[PDB]
Amino acid sequence: PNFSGNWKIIRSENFEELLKVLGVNVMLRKIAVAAASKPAVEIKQEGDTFYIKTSTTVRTTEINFKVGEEFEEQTVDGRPCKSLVKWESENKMVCEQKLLKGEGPKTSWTRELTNDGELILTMTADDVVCTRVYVRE
Ligand SMILES: CC(C)N1CCC(C)(C)c2cc(-c3ccc(/C=C/C(=O)O)cc3)ccc21
């Protein structure tokens, strides 16, 4: 079974720490943390073609990409960035991000499928590592 699914979060570490290092102020961090507690995550995968929708009441992100072909999205803190996703295996994709404008910490994300049917999202901003684990429902 591939990345396709409706994914439900079961673990999170260091989400607020991630927003902190990206310069998001306390009140905005509190809104984002509240929204991130209960996201709806939709992934449709066809080979290298991906649709990923992460939706909360206050902020929804939808990206369409092909692994290996560059695209524009936002960083986790809403900064426009150039993205490129590569395979590290059939079960792990790694995305390197470059800001369009301004200055800021180096950002990246990884999505990995475990043999036990979990999805692990890793988001980094310089030193800081945020891990979110999802299961299908
Ligand atoms: C003030 C509100 C509208 N605001 C602006 C600042 C920013 C971009 C940091 C943010 C981020 C989020 C947010 C929520 C969930 C996720 C991730 C969820 C997931 O992948 O499970 C990412 C960002 C929500 C809300 C939010």
Author numbering: 1 to 137
What is the paper's account of this structure, in its own sentences?
The cellular retinoic acid-binding proteins CRABPI and CRABPII act as gatekeepers and facilitators for the passage of all-trans-retinoic acid (and related derivatives) through the cytoplasm to access retinoic acid receptors (RARs) in the nucleus. In this article, crystal structures are presented of the L29C mutant of Homo sapiens CRABPI in complex with naturally occurring fatty acids (1.64 Å resolution) and with the synthetic retinoid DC645 (2.41 Å resolution), and of CRABPII in complex with the ligands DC479 (1.80 Å resolution) and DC645 (1.71 Å resolution). The retinoic acid-binding ability of both CRABPI and CRABPII is centred on a hydrophobic pocket created by an orthogonal β-sheet fold and capped with a pair of antiparallel α-helices formed from residues 15–35 partway into the sequence. The pocket contains, at its most buried end, a trio of residues (Arg112, Arg132 and Tyr134 in CRABPI; Arg112, Arg133 and Tyr135 in CRABPII) that are responsible for binding to the carboxylic acid moiety of ATRA, usually in concert with a water molecule that is conserved in all structures with similarly binding ligands.
